[PDB]
Amino acid sequence: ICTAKDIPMNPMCIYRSATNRRVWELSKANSRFATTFYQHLADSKNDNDNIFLSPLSISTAFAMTKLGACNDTLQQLMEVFKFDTISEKTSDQIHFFFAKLNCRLYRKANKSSKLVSANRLFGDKSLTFNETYQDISELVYGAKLQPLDFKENAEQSRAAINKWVSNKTEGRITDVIPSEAINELTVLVLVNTIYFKGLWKSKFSPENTRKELFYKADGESCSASMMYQEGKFRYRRVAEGTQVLELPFKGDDITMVLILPKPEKSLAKVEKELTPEVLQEWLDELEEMMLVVHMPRFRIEDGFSLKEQLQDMGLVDLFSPEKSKLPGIVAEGRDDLYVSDAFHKAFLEVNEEGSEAAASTAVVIAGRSLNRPFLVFIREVPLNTIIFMGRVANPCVK
């Protein structure tokens, strides 16, 4: 709906609880879901484990899912993704703000870094989806509905979807859908993708990079290539000796924030207390300063279902075959569609030239159920959005 093509129409179940304040609002909601998501996730993983995701991707894919949700399934969706925090209830205006949001995000607010996003739907080549549902998906999310033979060729189906994502992620993301997620009973598959590649506004030089000794929790040793640089950066040593460092990209509208808990300190606290407000506070305190950066040259992949975590977060209905409500999707009889499962997969690569991240979130309808430090944040400055985020627990990567 990117002011090229408010005014536009959209019809389905609607729930009730410059105007950029709505977009800025949306960004906050999005950010609120991110920190809360990160926690659960963290709380579920081993402290010394890697974490990497694009909460933004999760947001989108779920907003896309929201398009055909009904009374309560919709409500949860609204509350969980914090949609109900923006001003003016209008369930339908969410998608519009998202449209505007994504707009500014991927469309020509440019050229110093690569910020692309693609979305798509994959329904059964035999069913008849709601035309409006289809049209609003392509209009808001730019999501086209690709017919896939789930009944007769589910495996091939998955594979196809995975190949699409791979195309859309520069090969970075393959495998978003696991080996048995798609079956004969899959009606549709909502998919989002995000791809970033950026150049360091101030880059490290391979000449200063040095390999070195990396110890793990009770585990032996590994080798890490540590980058080095000296320069003026927006830094700040916050409470408890926690460090906060900002590394912008040539595409200065985009930056990478590092949060290092005081050496030997449990990352757990900081994380445990994570709020967008706490974050924003850190930011607001950053001062420019000459310093030496010891940063690793590394890569990290992250994959996982979202079902469990989102369930704990209040997303229950959506997942129940019995109480799920997604009536506005298939033209005839859309009266039995739960989200079997949802998957996420993120890739992160950091080196001397810059950084490169990618992720995918794919919601499947009626399918088959089932080493010390670091915090990363790739954010959109003007837009106040967390694109990517994670924990780097192993720089000597496999």
Swiss-Prot record:
<feature type="glycosylation site" description="N-linked (GlcNAc...) (complex) asparagine">
    <location>
        <position position="130"/>
    </location>
</feature>
<feature type="disulfide bond">
    <location>
        <begin position="222"/>
        <end position="396"/>
    </location>
</feature>
<dbReference type="GO" id="GO:0004867">
    <property type="term" value="F:serine-type endopeptidase inhibitor activity"/>
</dbReference>
<dbReference type="InterPro" id="IPR000215">
    <property type="entry name" value="Serpin_fam"/>
</dbReference>
<keyword id="KW-0225">Disease variant</keyword>
<feature type="glycosylation site" description="N-linked (GlcNAc...) asparagine">
    <location>
        <position position="110"/>
    </location>
</feature>
<feature type="site" description="Reactive bond">
    <location>
        <begin position="368"/>
        <end position="369"/>
    </location>
</feature>
<feature type="disulfide bond">
    <location>
        <begin position="13"/>
        <end position="70"/>
    </location>
</feature>
<dbReference type="GO" id="GO:0005788">
    <property type="term" value="C:endoplasmic reticulum lumen"/>
</dbReference>
<dbReference type="InterPro" id="IPR023796">
    <property type="entry name" value="Serpin_dom"/>
</dbReference>
<dbReference type="GO" id="GO:0008201">
    <property type="term" value="F:heparin binding"/>
</dbReference>
<comment type="subunit">
    <text>Forms protease inhibiting heterodimer with TMPRSS7.</text>
</comment>
<dbReference type="InterPro" id="IPR033829">
    <property type="entry name" value="Antithrombin_3_serpin_domain"/>
</dbReference>
<keyword id="KW-1015">Disulfide bond</keyword>
<feature type="binding site">
    <location>
        <position position="120"/>
    </location>
    <ligand>
        <name>heparin</name>
    </ligand>
</feature>
<keyword id="KW-0732">Signal</keyword>
<dbReference type="GO" id="GO:0072562">
    <property type="term" value="C:blood microparticle"/>
</dbReference>
<dbReference type="InterPro" id="IPR042185">
    <property type="entry name" value="Serpin_sf_2"/>
</dbReference>
<dbReference type="GO" id="GO:0005576">
    <property type="term" value="C:extracellular region"/>
</dbReference>
<dbReference type="InterPro" id="IPR036186">
    <property type="entry name" value="Serpin_sf"/>
</dbReference>
<keyword id="KW-0356">Hemostasis</keyword>
<dbReference type="Pfam" id="PF00079">
    <property type="entry name" value="Serpin"/>
</dbReference>
<keyword id="KW-0722">Serine protease inhibitor</keyword>
<dbReference type="GO" id="GO:0005615">
    <property type="term" value="C:extracellular space"/>
</dbReference>
<keyword id="KW-0646">Protease inhibitor</keyword>
<dbReference type="GO" id="GO:0005886">
    <property type="term" value="C:plasma membrane"/>
</dbReference>
<dbReference type="GO" id="GO:0007596">
    <property type="term" value="P:blood coagulation"/>
</dbReference>
<comment type="similarity">
    <text>Belongs to the serpin family.</text>
</comment>
<dbReference type="InterPro" id="IPR042178">
    <property type="entry name" value="Serpin_sf_1"/>
</dbReference>
<keyword id="KW-0597">Phosphoprotein</keyword>
<keyword id="KW-0358">Heparin-binding</keyword>
<dbReference type="GO" id="GO:0030193">
    <property type="term" value="P:regulation of blood coagulation"/>
</dbReference>
<keyword id="KW-0792">Thrombophilia</keyword>
<dbReference type="GO" id="GO:0002020">
    <property type="term" value="F:protease binding"/>
</dbReference>
<dbReference type="GO" id="GO:0062023">
    <property type="term" value="C:collagen-containing extracellular matrix"/>
</dbReference>
<keyword id="KW-0094">Blood coagulation</keyword>
<comment type="function">
    <text>Most important serine protease inhibitor in plasma that regulates the blood coagulation cascade. AT-III inhibits thrombin, matriptase-3/TMPRSS7, as well as factors IXa, Xa and XIa. Its inhibitory activity is greatly enhanced in the presence of heparin.</text>
</comment>
<feature type="binding site">
    <location>
        <position position="24"/>
    </location>
    <ligand>
        <name>heparin</name>
    </ligand>
</feature>
<feature type="glycosylation site" description="N-linked (GlcNAc...) asparagine">
    <location>
        <position position="167"/>
    </location>
</feature>
<feature type="binding site">
    <location>
        <position position="104"/>
    </location>
    <ligand>
        <name>heparin</name>
    </ligand>
</feature>
<dbReference type="InterPro" id="IPR023795">
    <property type="entry name" value="Serpin_CS"/>
</dbReference>
<feature type="disulfide bond">
    <location>
        <begin position="2"/>
        <end position="103"/>
    </location>
</feature>
